[PDB]
Design a protein around this ligand. Structure first.
Ligand SMILES: COC(=O)Cc1ccc2c(c1)NC(=O)c1ccc(-c3cncn3C)cc1N2
Length: 266
């Protein structure tokens, strides 16, 4: 069928750059990442197949410029669903957190750590389904069933686990669990608890001193706050694992009604 391989770039999604591409014949919308770390991003993306992970369709190398064809998420970033200093309704945050856990369980199960979980990297499709995005900082932490301890410092300071700043080596999975707890905090309070998780940071000191009468903790209900108390644990070996997050009382609390299906009366 002619012209089916032709895509028109209609708008910038990010600044290399990301463009929204529309098929000339079928009008299918895809996201194209234009990159002038890249070899590893394509390699990790070729391993991914999950409903809460941005799908990789393929790539083209036109000289030195790499084109990555990715699943288009029309709802944009989770970041823009968070009202500053307020957050979002607790049932919405719970549903987003469930979808985030399913995606992170999937990645860890195939031995991949994202290493930069934050709301800017959590995209929403047309039905508000969360998708983990950008594998440019991602790495393999388990290969041939042998875990590899990490030592590279990466991510975003408000979302990084304290062991990345204090220890030479650290396990990959508790790092991702910690950043999911900062995401949960941001969704429930609409603010980040500290600039970085260090003893020099007063906000982080207050948290370890259990001063939950201060912001952002004062805005959060006791049931999700008890979960955050188990995630935002300084010692990564004492920190709650995802199988145990799935048994938490708030995680399993019925809060949200399903999609508003059309209905008539009489
Ligand atoms: C509220 O805004 C909207 O409704 C439009 C909008 C804005 C930003 C993004 C997207 C859609 N959707 C993507 O699929 C998308 C795809 C890729 C990227 C991206 C950004 N940095 C790396 N990557 C892979 C960003 C995206 N975000």
């Amino acid at each position: 069928v002619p012209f089916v391989e032709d895509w028109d770039l209609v708008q910038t999604l990010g600044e290399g750059e990301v463009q929204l591409a529309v098929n000339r014949v079928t009008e299918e919308a895809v996201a194209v990442k234009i990159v002038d770390n890249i070899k590893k991003e394509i390699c990790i993306n070729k391993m991914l197949n999950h409903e809460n992970v941005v799908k990789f369709y393929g790539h083209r190398r036109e000289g030195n410029i790499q084109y990555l064809f990715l699943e288009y998420c029309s709802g944009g970033e989770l970041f823009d669903r968070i009202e500053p200093d307020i957050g979002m309704p607790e049932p919405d945050a719970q549903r987003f957190f469930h979808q985030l856990m399913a995606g992170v369980v999937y990645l860890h199960g195939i031995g991949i750590t994202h290493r930069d979980i934050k709301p800017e990297n959590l995209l929403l499709d047309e039905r508000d389904n969360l998708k983990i995005s950008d594998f440019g900082l991602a790495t393999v932490f388990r290969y041939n069933n042998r875990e590899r301890l990490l030592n590279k410092m990466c991510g975003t300071l408000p979302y990084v686990a304290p062991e990345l700043l204090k220890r030479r080596e650290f396990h990959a999975e508790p790092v991702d669990v910690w950043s999911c707890g900062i995401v949960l905090t941001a969704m429930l309070a609409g603010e980040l608890p500290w600039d970085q998780p260090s003893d020099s940071c007063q906000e982080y000191s207050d948290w370890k001193e259990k001063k939950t009468y201060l912001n952002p903790w004062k805005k959060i209900d006791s049931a999700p706050l008890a979960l955050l108390h188990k995630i935002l644990v300084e010692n990564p070996s004492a920190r709650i694992t995802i199988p145990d997050i799935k048994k938490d009382r708030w995680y399993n609390k019925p809060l949200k009604k399903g999609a508003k299906r059309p209905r008539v009366t009489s």
